[model samples]
Target: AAVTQSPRNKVAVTGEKVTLSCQQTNNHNNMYWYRQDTGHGLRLIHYSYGVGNTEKGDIPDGYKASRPSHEQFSLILVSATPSQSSVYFCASGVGGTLYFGAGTRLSVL
Candidate 1:
């Protein structure tokens, strides 16, 4: 299984506090995210984690969510400052396979 994305229905949000969640099912592999949009470049939030438990050591506070319930993961921005403005895309991957959700565009005031 793999996760990837392209020019799709953009997921845009604007506010002081923001969050983005990505959910993946079993039978695939690991989960990951690569953000790409205007003003920002492509950056890897984290490598990957096991299926069940939420790896706090690997999850970045301002990036990956603290809780991973079943097949879902989330990324939250506590303070939606201008520096946190960008498009985020979540994905699932295995080896070379990659899958991405519709781009998430977030703008902060």
Candidate 2:
């Protein structure tokens, strides 16, 4: 299957929920990132963002964002009950074409 951004977010088993996956066939080139941001011991996740269009080798725009309205749409970072750690993953392209990094945040026991 063609690697994509949307299909990345996932819920992992093992008392752990995973919601994010990225892969590319273009030699892992032109990678980008994005994610939500917040305070209170919470950091934002890495994401890809390309402005205007994702056709002309543009980097996806994933910034540290925050929610202010009831309809909050900010990304979230989860920490295992017994573990405390945050990670961020970024996309990588062999020739700078298409790629995605693994989640930078992972709570391991």
Candidate 3:
């Protein structure tokens, strides 16, 4: 697959830390992390460049990301809470066409 994500489903307690990993084999120059909440549109959480270049996105507070290599990107949730429970989607591609992963389902109780 061009883009892939791990942890098909997860459940955590309040104030716990959660990590979501993504990998892309297409050698894209850009990768993105976004979340979708029930009854809400997608929200950008983070983005990473080629490597070692991570940037906060539209909704970045309480979250951080890392880009260690050209093929790997990760999103970390610090002190996750119930409000953060949602399905997270990762993407990799040029700005013209984005390839999205199946998504990671997380529940914070």
Candidate 4:
């Protein structure tokens, strides 16, 4: 499956909820979400699977993925803050190696 992200870029006001998305071409059970800030390098946001198993990648409750699908595993911001502004990447994994998607640039005002 080729990973893909929507909106290319987005903006959200402070104290808000922002919708983010990812899609794939074919069935791939495991998925990973990464949020990377320009200066912060990268931080694991959520790791989920088609089986509905989701665990803390690094950032906890503030970010999550629910109802994960085989082709799409979408996540949204529970609460948007200026600190939450960053780039998000989605990837599908198989046999340990991961195939990454494009990043979605988001801004939280």
User: Which candidate wins on TM-score?
Assistant: 3
> Model 4 segments beyond 4 Å from truth?
none
Candidate 3, lDDT over the whole model: 0.91
Model 1, 36-72: lDDT tens digits are 6677566666545645544443325465453355455
Which candidate order results from sorting by lDDT in descending order?
3, 4, 1, 2
Q: How would you encode candidate 2's per-residue C-alpha lDDT over 1-109 as one tens digit per residue?
A: 3333433334333344344434444443244333322333223233223212132113223223222222111233242322323343445444435444444443434
- Candidate lDDT scores, in order, read 0.57, 0.35, 0.91, 0.78
Question: Which wins on lDDT, candidate 1 or candidate 3?
Answer: 3
At residue 77, candidate 2 shows an lDDT of 29
Candidate 3 residue pairs in backbone clash: none
Number of clashes recorded per candidate: 11, 43, 0, 0
The numbered model that scores best in lDDT is 3
Ranking by TM-score: 3, 4, 1, 2
TM-score of each: 0.65, 0.26, 0.94, 0.87
Root mean square deviation (Cα) for candidate 3? 1.0
User: What are the runs in model 2 whose C-alpha is more than 4 Å off?
Assistant: 1-3, 6-14, 29-89, 94-109
* TM-score of candidate 2 versus the correct structure, residues matched by position: 0.26
Q: Model 3 TM-score?
A: 0.94
Model 4 alpha-carbon miss at residue 49, Å:
2.6
